[PDB]
Amino acid sequence: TFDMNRVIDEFDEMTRNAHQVQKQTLKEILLKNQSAIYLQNCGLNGNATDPEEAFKSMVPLVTDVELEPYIKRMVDGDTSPILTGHPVPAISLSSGTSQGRPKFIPFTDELMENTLQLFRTAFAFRNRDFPIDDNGKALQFIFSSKQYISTGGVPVGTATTNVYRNPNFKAGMKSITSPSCSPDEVIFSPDVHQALYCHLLSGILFRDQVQYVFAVFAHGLVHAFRTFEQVWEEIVTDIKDGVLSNRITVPSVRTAMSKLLTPNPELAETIRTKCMSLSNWYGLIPALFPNAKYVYGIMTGSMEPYVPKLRHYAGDLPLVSHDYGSSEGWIAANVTPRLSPEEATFAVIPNLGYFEFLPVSETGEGEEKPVGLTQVKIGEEYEVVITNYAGLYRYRLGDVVKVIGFYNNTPQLKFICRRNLILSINIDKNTERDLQLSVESAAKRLSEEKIEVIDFSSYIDVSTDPGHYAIFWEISGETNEDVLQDCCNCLDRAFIDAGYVSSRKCKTIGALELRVVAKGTFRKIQEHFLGLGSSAGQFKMPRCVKPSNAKVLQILCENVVSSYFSTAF
Amino acid sequence: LPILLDYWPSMFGMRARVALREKGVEFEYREEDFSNKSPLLLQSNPIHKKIPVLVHNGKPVCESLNVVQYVDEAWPEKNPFFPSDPYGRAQARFWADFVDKKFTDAQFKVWGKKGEEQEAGKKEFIEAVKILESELGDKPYFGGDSFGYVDISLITFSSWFQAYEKFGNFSIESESPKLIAWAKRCMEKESVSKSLPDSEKIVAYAAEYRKNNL
Amino acid sequence: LPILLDYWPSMFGMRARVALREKGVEFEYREEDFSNKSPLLLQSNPIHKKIPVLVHNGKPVCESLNVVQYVDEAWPEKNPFFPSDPYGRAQARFWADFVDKKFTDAQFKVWGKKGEEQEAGKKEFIEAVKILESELGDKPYFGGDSFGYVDISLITFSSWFQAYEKFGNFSIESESPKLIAWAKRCMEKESVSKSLPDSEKIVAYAAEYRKNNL
Numbered sequence: 001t002f003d004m005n006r007v008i009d010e011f012d013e014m015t016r017n018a019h020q021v022q023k024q025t026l027k028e029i030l031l032k033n034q035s036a037i038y039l040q041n042c043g044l045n046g047n048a049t050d051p052e053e054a055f056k057s058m059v060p061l062v063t064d065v066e067l068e069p070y071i072k073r074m075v076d077g078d079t080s081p082i083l084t085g086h087p088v089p090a091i092s093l094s095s096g097t098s099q100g101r102p103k104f105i106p107f108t109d110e111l112m113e114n115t116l117q118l119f120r121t122a123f124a125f126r127n128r129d130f131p132i133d134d135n136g137k138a139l140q141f142i143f144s145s146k147q148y149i150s151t152g153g154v155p156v157g158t159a160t161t162n163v164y165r166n167p168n169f170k171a172g173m174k175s176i177t178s179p180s181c182s183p184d185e186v187i188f189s190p191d192v193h194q195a196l197y198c199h200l201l202s203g204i205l206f207r208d209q210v211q212y213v214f215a216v217f218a219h220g221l222v223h224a225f226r227t228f229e230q231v232w233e234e235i236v237t238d239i240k241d242g243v244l245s246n247r248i249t250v251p252s253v254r255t256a257m258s259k260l261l262t263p264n265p266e267l268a269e270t271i272r273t274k275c276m277s278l279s280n281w282y283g284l285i286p287a288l289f290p291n292a293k294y295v296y297g298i299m300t301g302s303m304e305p306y307v308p309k310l311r312h313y314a315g316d317l318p319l320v321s322h323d324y325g326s327s328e329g330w331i332a333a334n335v336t337p338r339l340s341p342e343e344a345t346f347a348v349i350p351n352l353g354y355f356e357f358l359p360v361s362e363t364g365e366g367e368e369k370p371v372g373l374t375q376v377k378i379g380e381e382y383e384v385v386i387t388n389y390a391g392l393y394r395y396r397l398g399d400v401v402k403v404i405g406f407y408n409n410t411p412q413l414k415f416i417c418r419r420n421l422i423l424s425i426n427i428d429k430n431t432e433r434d435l436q437l438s439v440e441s442a443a444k445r446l447s448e449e450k451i452e453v454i455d456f457s458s459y460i461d462v463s464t465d466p467g468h469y470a471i472f473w474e475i476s477g478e479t480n481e482d483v484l485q486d487c488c489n490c491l492d493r494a495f496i497d498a499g500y501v502s503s504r505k506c507k508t509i510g511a512l513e514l515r516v517v518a519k520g521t522f523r524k525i526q527e528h529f530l531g532l533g534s535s536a537g538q539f540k541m542p543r544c545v546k547p548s549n550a551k552v553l554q555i556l557c558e559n560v561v562s563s564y565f566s567t568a569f
Numbered sequence: 570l571p572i573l574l575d576y577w578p579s580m581f582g583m584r585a586r587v588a589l590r591e592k593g594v595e596f597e598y599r600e601e602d603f604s605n606k607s608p609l610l611l612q613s614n615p616i617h618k619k620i621p622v623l624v625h626n627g628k629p630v631c632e633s634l635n636v637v638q639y640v641d642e643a644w645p646e647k648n649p650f651f652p653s654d655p656y657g658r659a660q661a662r663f664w665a666d667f668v669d670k671k672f673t674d675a676q677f678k679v680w681g682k683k684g685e686e687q688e689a690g691k692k693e694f695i696e697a698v699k700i701l702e703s704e705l706g707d708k709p710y711f712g713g714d715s716f717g718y719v720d721i722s723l724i725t726f727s728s729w730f731q732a733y734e735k736f737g738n739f740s741i742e743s744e745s746p747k748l749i750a751w752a753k754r755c756m757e758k759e760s761v762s763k764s765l766p767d768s769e770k771i772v773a774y775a776a777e778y779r780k781n782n783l
Numbered sequence: 784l785p786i787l788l789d790y791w792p793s794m795f796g797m798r799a800r801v802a803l804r805e806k807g808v809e810f811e812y813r814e815e816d817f818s819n820k821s822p823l824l825l826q827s828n829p830i831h832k833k834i835p836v837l838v839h840n841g842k843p844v845c846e847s848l849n850v851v852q853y854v855d856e857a858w859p860e861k862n863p864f865f866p867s868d869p870y871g872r873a874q875a876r877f878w879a880d881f882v883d884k885k886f887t888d889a890q891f892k893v894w895g896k897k898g899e900e901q902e903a904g905k906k907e908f909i910e911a912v913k914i915l916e917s918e919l920g921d922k923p924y925f926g927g928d929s930f931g932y933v934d935i936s937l938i939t940f941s942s943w944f945q946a947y948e949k950f951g952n953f954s955i956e957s958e959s960p961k962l963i964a965w966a967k968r969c970m971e972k973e974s975v976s977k978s979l980p981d982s983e984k985i986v987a988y989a990a991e992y993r994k995n996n997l
């Protein structure tokens with residue numbers, strides 16, 4: 001049960017018990033997992049009396065390529081358990097690449113526990129700093145409308161959907177969040193771009209009780225408002241006659257909205273009057289929700305450039321930065337949210353995993369062995385190494401963070417990172433230049449509509465005979481199918497090399513499938529990744545999916561705003 | 570500075586703009602109110618009073634295909650649209666004539682007229698896109714191994730494809746896809762990616778034309 | 784030897800004959816029966832099935848003007864049809880199109896039609912001859928210092944001047960002695976002295992057409 005003083009006290013005690021909680025976290029992880037085959041090769045049995053020393057001296061550090069076959073083994077029809085253990089209810093992918101190709105990570109209910117708790121504690125601390133009304137609501141441009149099933153009959157999933165479609169998400173989050181404005185079905189509509197239009201609409205719908213504007217990122221908040229700049233008049237049109245724009249075609253969301261609409265002409269006068277009064281839309285969020293105490297999101301590192309466009313949208317509204325972590329592991333929580341983003345730092349929560357840090361203190365890089373969490377050094381930069389229930393044991397994520405200070409006995413971390421970058425040679429290509437060029441060539445057919453393509457991705461489906469390619473696209477608006485089918489043909493025709501030619505013309509590699517996705521999918525990928533526990537170097541989103549990338553993969557299927565098999569060929 | 574007398578939805582004006590931009594010229598565009606054909610235009614073509622009109626050396630150059638080959642001959646050092654051989658040139662011109670006749674009239678029928686006229690125009694454009702699809706065969710373009718003369722000539726029709734798809738209530742891609750397909754391929758050239766207006770607007774123009782004449 | 788698929792009374796066909804004779808190319812003439820078109824006409828032009836068609840190098844060239852430009856392009860060694868400059872050929876193409884369309888339309892309305900359209904067509908023909916006469920300013924030929932491109936395009940209609948004089952009941956010599964006489968100058972050339980069939984034959988033929996269709 002969410003309360004303020006008790007959780008923060010427990011949190012304080014816990015953070016002073018940081019070393020103990022961490023070591024015990026190791027113990028619970030392994031007592032849970034004495035059986036991992038990865039461990040047999042390391043020599044583990046557990047218990048004993050030199051356990052942490054044993055794990056640190058016996059278990060080798062690992063990369064995405066090495067972990068790839070094993071979790072891959074878990075996903076593809078070999079529903080079997082390996083790096084952690086149990087066949088997991090979902091699987092991930094990781095930003096940056098694994099030799100240009102995809103990386104999988106296990107999901108278990110523990111991560112959900114970590115989820116409710118970090119949100120619970122952080123909400124208590126922020127509600128401490130930005131006290132809300134207990135009967136209001138909030139603008140969450142949150143989505144999780146998609147779920148794919150791995151080729152093995154196993155669910156593979158993004159952080160979001162796994163959270164939101166989880167059996168415990170609603171009851172658990174009921175107490176620590178102001179109620180969502182959108183029906184869950186709108187949140188899970190098969191059309192999140194139309195649903196985003198709906199989200200803007202729903203949040204805007206209960207403004208007086210609305211306590212905060214939420215997106216995990218500045219990128220999302222910014223995208224939402226530049227979009228509002230585009231569509232406010234349309235929004236007036238849809239809301240007024242009690243009839244939504246013909247732009248929305250999916251019957252579930254449309255049905256829900258119809259459950260939500262009756263003709264109301266006066267208010268239009270209002271919105272048009274205020275919306276024309278602003279100066280280049282500076283300070284819109286306080287305008288829409290005049291009593292919001294804050295704009296909530298990840299504002300540091302690579303999100304820093306979008307904080308200003310957002311700041312412009314947010315005006316003088318205080319900007320509060322969100323915490324640090326992911327399905328690959330939770331790291332830190334901001335417990336002093338009132339700090340501005342440039343100076344914002346997030347403190348680590350100790351039972352979400354067992355963490356180690358490699359210092360960059362030698363030159364570039366440097367052969368120093370990992371030192372303990374509270375043994376880390378003030379003002380210096382280290383790379384986060386993770387051990388948790390996510391198939392990650394002493395895993396090198398590849399990101400650098402700096403310790404600004406300490407909250408009691410637990411450290412305060414800072415992120416000036418962007419990309420976990422060095423690259424390697426791929427196979428989900430079709431040179432990255434070829435693929436980018438592909439979307440570029442097909443997308444201008446969209447550009448004929450004043451729409452620009454904001455993002456894209458792909459997938460290789462080999463459960464099918466013959467196997468086929470799937471191209472994923474994020475665009476600025478709802479459009480007609482004929483142009484989209486044409487696009488799929490262009491992507492196909494953009495793979496200019498002689499090889500692809502040989503295949504699809506031969507049909508031994510099946511017709512490429514353009515399953516067009518909705519707004520916020522790639523925003524979802526970005527939003528997960530930067531928050532991911534390590535350090536902001538989490539933004540080179542992998543472009544095409546070999547059956548070993550899952551974050552994009554869950555967000556693959558359900559919002560097929562449309563999905564097709566080429567009528568050409 | 571080359572001065573072009575152009576019309577926003579002119580597939581022909583587009584032939585001119587695409588041709589010049591394809592080549593590498595910096596030029597000026599002037600939109601025309603055909604209700605008030607401008608004084609330089611009334612002197613460019615005092616009888617046809619039609620565009621596109623490129624003016625060079627104070628000499629009016631008229632007709633779209635004429636204008637594009639004008640484009641070729643005006644700067645013969647970098648981007649040629651024809652191949653080296655006379656026969657290849659003959660093939661390209663041949664196909665140019667092709668785009669200009671049954672194809673243009675058939676589309677004109679599909680988005681400008683309805684009913685009895687409409688169906689005839691519809692089987693006409695599907696037939697044209699078919700022969701078209703056959704001759705495209707495999708080439709990235711049409712008039713040479715790279716971006717060609719005719720490439721310029723029929724690419725500009727591909728922003729109206731949307732209008733044809735809707736009033737026609739068809740889908741010209743399932744019957745002949747490699748064509749529109751080749752079209753959004755051809756959109757990646759900066760020549761047409763900046764010369765051609767939006768299709769929703771073009772559709773709307775077709776819609777205005779239709780609303781005016783029922 | 785190059786094979787020309789042609790029709791003896793067809794002016795456009797005469798255009799093709801004119802280009803080859805003006806040049807010095809030696810060829811074999813072929814008469815088609817559009818009632819029973821030969822497999823060569825069907826295999827060269829599977830779409831239009833029209834004439835003329837020139838098979839040179841085992842490669843077919845369809846359409847009359849397209850053929851003329853094919854002839855000038857194939858044989859750029861002795862008698863050049865176009866001027867050197869882009870703009871001169873440009874004007875030539877502009878004019879070839881004009882004679883090809885409105886002039887051909889008006890004349891066709893003169894010989895193949897009756898009543899109001901014939902009168903309209905007559906007014907159109909006399910104004911068109913007026914525009915031709917004016918464009919030349921008073922020029923001996925049309926496409927170069929010697930016999931030119933659209934000279935070739937228009938001259939074949941000189942074999943039909945008699946047909947128009949008779950059916951349209953107009954004197955294109957009393958009203959434009961310069962154009963008819965332009966033709967009669969061109970008549971001293973074998974390209975016109977041997978390719979354009981006797982005006983008597985054409986006159987009887989167009990009249991005979993008038994007999995067949997109502």
Ligand SMILES: Nc1ncnc2c1ncn2[C@@H]1O[C@H](COP(=O)(O)OP(=O)(O)OP(=O)(O)O)[C@@H](O)[C@H]1O
Nearest residue numbers: 090091092107111112115157158159162325326327
């Ligand atoms: N940063 C984060 N954002 C959202 N959910 C997170 C995050 N970190 C952990 N989770 C949680 O992980 C659990 C679900 O995400 P999840 O673990 O399913 O996906 P997964 O299959 O491991 O891999 P991934 O999220 O990286 O695709 C949820 O409880 C979820 O809250």
Ligand SMILES: N[C@@H](CCC(=O)N[C@@H](CS)C(=O)NCC(=O)O)C(=O)O
Nearest residue numbers: 579581603618619620621632633634
């Ligand atoms: N073949 C011509 C066709 C041009 C044409 O018909 N243009 C129309 C535009 S639809 C025009 O200018 N019409 C004059 C008018 O309608 O005012 C070309 O390529 O320019």
Ligand SMILES: N[C@@H](CCC(=O)N[C@@H](CS)C(=O)NCC(=O)O)C(=O)O
Nearest residue numbers: 790793795817832833834835846847
């Ligand atoms: N552009 C073509 C069109 C001319 C045309 O239709 N010509 C007539 C010959 S006079 C023809 O070939 N008719 C075909 C038929 O009789 O069906 C040309 O100039 O030859």
Ligand SMILES: CC/C=C\C[C@H]1C(=O)CC[C@@H]1CC(=O)O
Nearest residue numbers: 114115118119216323325326531
């Ligand atoms: C415990 C947090 C559960 C989900 C967290 C997600 C939000 O809803 C805010 C972003 C956050 C992602 C992140 O910080 O890693």
Ligand SMILES: CC(C)[C@H](N)C(=O)O
Nearest residue numbers: 159160216524527528
């Ligand atoms: C909770 C959520 C939005 C998560 N950060 C993601 O994008 O996957």
